[PDB]
Design a protein around this ligand. Structure first.
Ligand SMILES: Nc1ncnc2c1ncn2[C@@H]1O[C@H](COP(=O)(O)OP(=O)(O)OP(=O)(O)O)[C@@H](O)[C@H]1O
Ligand SMILES: Nc1ncnc2c1ncn2[C@@H]1O[C@H](COP(=O)(O)OP(=O)(O)OP(=O)(O)O)[C@@H](O)[C@H]1O
Ligand SMILES: [Mg+2]
Ligand SMILES: [Mg+2]
Lengths: 257, 257
């Protein structure tokens, strides 16, 4: 029911990190969840969730009738009710079609997935447009830096004009701001925008703030989404985010020096 | 004569940082240089070079006959023989055409530019393909992490199959590896791939290693390409890179802790 795109425009801000962590948190809360790699050509989700060697069929194979969801969905290694739909290594802009994508989303809804997390590619070309097109909600992943922040602002424009909902005048895509790689030291020395600074500029509700954290690269190398590291500030920050996404309120930690 | 694309596939590895720095180093060595923003419509090069307020016309305006190069080219603020061709804020995948782009490149060659540095968008969709299509050389911008490194490998495949040169069997695009955000501490603790590790995997000649450096965000905020900061390891690393690009050999510093 809740299709959430993880987007940014700006490259390398942490979309996939966030997609893996958030999808895992949701599933840990009992919500049946699939996280989908929309980053066709340059797949990465399966590496981050550490299910690489179980990749048999992909998003494109399914669209193209070469495999069913049942064949393509990978059951997560660590967390119940979590599934992964990996991206094709093929490059082919049209490979993902609106019609195909739409059908996949209908089919997953039909498997009673509560949450469908869509890991977007960078940019605002067709790759990222596809990823957000059918979104109900959007997580704008933003580093507290001018460029990330500008690109995020632009992404908002696109959310409000080139999504299905914005083209058919339905309720607009719900917008969540997720600040990532927040370095409070750097912020007090005036090189990064404060949480507040960014909020003034973007003007959407903050869903999370993920501290800059050495545990994230470690999580990646292990193929273990950081949230599974219970001692990691970044992990806790993601658990908090998942709480906010589910209606609970939580104070924002790891934002002070 | 030397058209060099700065590419990566992987988002946020530092293509624009590198483009600005390298383009500036070349011009500083007396080589007439233009650096072009291919990242339409998430433009960023003009921010990094700090010429934002002088943006009048862009890459698309020129293609579309709405302006000439002379009207669109921005003369750099600090460095002689350096010019900037900013990207359009418009979003339109076709906005840049092969025919248009090709013509622009011919015209710049005609203004006797020795170096044409092309700042690529992330990904391997049409944005990045356009950026590398007419390349003579390619700077593969890579963070010493598994994903960056994988995507860089993939970029190489694309360089050797979907560039003009690879489609007409001309001399292949010359491949330069540029390791960025190299954190020697992290590397010795086994979280980042050593310079050597990456070299085994990518297998192209190293042109530079840019240390992780707080000066880079400072450079960006200032709009002063980091190479102009003479006290910055990152800047020195870029000056070294420019030396290597021009045939000189230099040992790789800031790689040890
Ligand atoms: N909280 C954090 N602390 C430290 N490093 C982080 C954090 N979040 C992300 N990173 C780093 O940022 C880089 C990009 O992460 P990730 O691949 O998730 O970003 P992305 O936006 O999905 O990238 P792309 O644009 O290629 O899709 C990685 O090097 C990751 O380690
Ligand atoms: N040597 C470095 N030290 C510290 N930070 C760096 C370094 N190089 C790049 N960065 C940081 O990495 C992030 C991305 O930089 P940049 O925008 O130049 O990369 P990019 O590949 O052009 O991104 P995109 O994929 O959006 O085009 C920025 O936060 C920048 O400050
Ligand atoms: Mg990603
Ligand atoms: Mg860039």
């Amino acid at each position: 029911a809740r299709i959430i795109v993880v987007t940014s425009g700006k490259g390398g801000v942490g979309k996939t990190t966030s997609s893996a962590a958030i999808a895992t948190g949701l599933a840990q809360k009992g919500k049946k969840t699939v996280v989908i790699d929309f980053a066709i050509g340059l797949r990465n989700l399966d590496l981050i969730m550490g299910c690489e060697r179980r990749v048999v069929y992909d998003f494109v194979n399914v669209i193209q009738g070469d495999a069913t969801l049942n064949q393509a969905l990978i059951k997560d290694k660590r967390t119940e009710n979590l599934y992964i739909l990996p991206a094709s290594q093929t490059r082919d802009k049209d490979a993902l079609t609106r019609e195909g994508v739409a059908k996949v989303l209908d089919d997953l809804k039909a498997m009673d997935f509560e949450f469908i997390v869509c890991d977007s590619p960078a940019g605002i070309e067709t790759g990222a447009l596809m990823a957000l097109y059918f979104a109900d909600e959007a997580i704008i992943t933003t580093n507290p830096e001018v460029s990330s922040v500008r690109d995020s602002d632009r992404i908002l424009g696109i959310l409000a004009s080139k999504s299905r909902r914005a083209e058919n005048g339905e309720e607009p895509i719900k917008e969540h701001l997720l600040l990532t790689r927040y370095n409070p030291g750097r912020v007090s020395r005036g090189d990064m925008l404060s949480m507040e600074d960014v909020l003034e500029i973007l003007r959407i509700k903050l869903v999370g703030v993920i501290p800059e954290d050495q545990s994230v690269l470690r999580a990646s190398n292990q193929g273990e989404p950081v949230i599974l590291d219970i001692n990691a500030d970044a992990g806790k920050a993601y658990a908090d985010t998942v709480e906010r996404l589910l209606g609970e309120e939580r104070p924002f930690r790891f934002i002070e020096e």
